[PDB]
Design an enzyme around this catalytic site. Sequence first.
Site, PDB file in Angstrom:
ATOM      1  N   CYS A  53     -16.773  -2.464  -3.603  1.00 50.56           N
ATOM      2  CA  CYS A  53     -18.021  -1.844  -3.920  1.00 50.56           C
ATOM      3  C   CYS A  53     -17.980  -1.177  -5.301  1.00 50.56           C
ATOM      4  O   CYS A  53     -18.898  -1.364  -6.107  1.00 50.56           O
ATOM      5  CB  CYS A  53     -18.441  -0.855  -2.815  1.00 50.56           C
ATOM      6  SG  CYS A  53     -17.356   0.604  -2.566  1.00 50.56           S
ATOM      7  N   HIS A 116     -18.574   4.626  -0.016  1.00 54.06           N
ATOM      8  CA  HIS A 116     -19.248   3.371  -0.360  1.00 54.06           C
ATOM      9  C   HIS A 116     -20.247   3.670  -1.475  1.00 54.06           C
ATOM     10  O   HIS A 116     -20.629   4.820  -1.675  1.00 54.06           O
ATOM     11  CB  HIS A 116     -19.871   2.730   0.870  1.00 54.06           C
ATOM     12  CG  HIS A 116     -20.548   1.434   0.579  1.00 54.06           C
ATOM     13  ND1 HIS A 116     -19.862   0.318   0.136  1.00 54.06           N
ATOM     14  CD2 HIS A 116     -21.852   1.084   0.638  1.00 54.06           C
ATOM     15  CE1 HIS A 116     -20.713  -0.675  -0.046  1.00 54.06           C
ATOM     16  NE2 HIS A 116     -21.933  -0.239   0.275  1.00 54.06           N
ATOM     17  N   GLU A 133     -25.246  -4.228  -3.588  1.00 58.69           N
ATOM     18  CA  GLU A 133     -23.878  -3.723  -3.412  1.00 58.69           C
ATOM     19  C   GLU A 133     -22.883  -4.854  -3.280  1.00 58.69           C
ATOM     20  O   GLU A 133     -23.276  -5.986  -2.935  1.00 58.69           O
ATOM     21  CB  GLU A 133     -23.804  -2.819  -2.189  1.00 58.69           C
ATOM     22  CG  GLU A 133     -23.925  -3.642  -0.888  1.00 58.69           C
ATOM     23  CD  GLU A 133     -24.378  -2.880   0.341  1.00 58.69           C
ATOM     24  OE1 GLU A 133     -24.320  -1.620   0.386  1.00 58.69           O
ATOM     25  OE2 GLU A 133     -24.737  -3.591   1.303  1.00 58.69           O
TER      26      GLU A 133
HETATM   27 ZN   LIG Z   1     -15.849   0.738  -0.971  1.00 60.28          ZN
END
Ligand SMILES: [Zn+2]
Length: 164
Positions: A53, A116, A133
């Site tokens: 990410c 995240h 993402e």
């Molecule tokens: Zn991550």
Amino acid sequence: AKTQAEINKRLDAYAKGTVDSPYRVKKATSYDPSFGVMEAGAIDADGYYHAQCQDLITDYVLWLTDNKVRTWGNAKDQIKQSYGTGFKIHENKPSTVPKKGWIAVFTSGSYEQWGHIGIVYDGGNTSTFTILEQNWNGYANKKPTKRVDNYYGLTHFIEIPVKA
Ligand SMILES: [Zn+2]
Ligand SMILES: [Ca+2]
Ligand code: NA
């Protein structure tokens, strides 16, 4: 700084696998047996862990700052650093609705250990928004992909500078 039109174009190019980035995988690439083979279009900015990410954000922030600012650390560490002038960190309050091109940062609940992170593609409303993402699947193999999010675990937004 970049215009909204330039930002919007770059987000579509991430999702299409055509972004002008030297960190975009051209041919399906593998080196880490723990992760799936990275498909063409994946962004790998550090050469570790395939396409995570934070890799997307590293690329995006390099582009926004003409290669002056390279992020360090994991997704959750992004709110402990500054990308510089015109970047602002906002706490996600129940009132808060983000803008296209802002960075969404998840640091609570199931996301606490590493965080995240992704880019706001559609600001949505107080209930949902669309994120762009990498690695929501954990296999670190896909190109940047859009997903509808319900703000669960989402603690902060990073506002980016926009050129008039
Ligand atoms: Zn991550
Ligand atoms: Ca990587
Ligand atoms: Na909110």
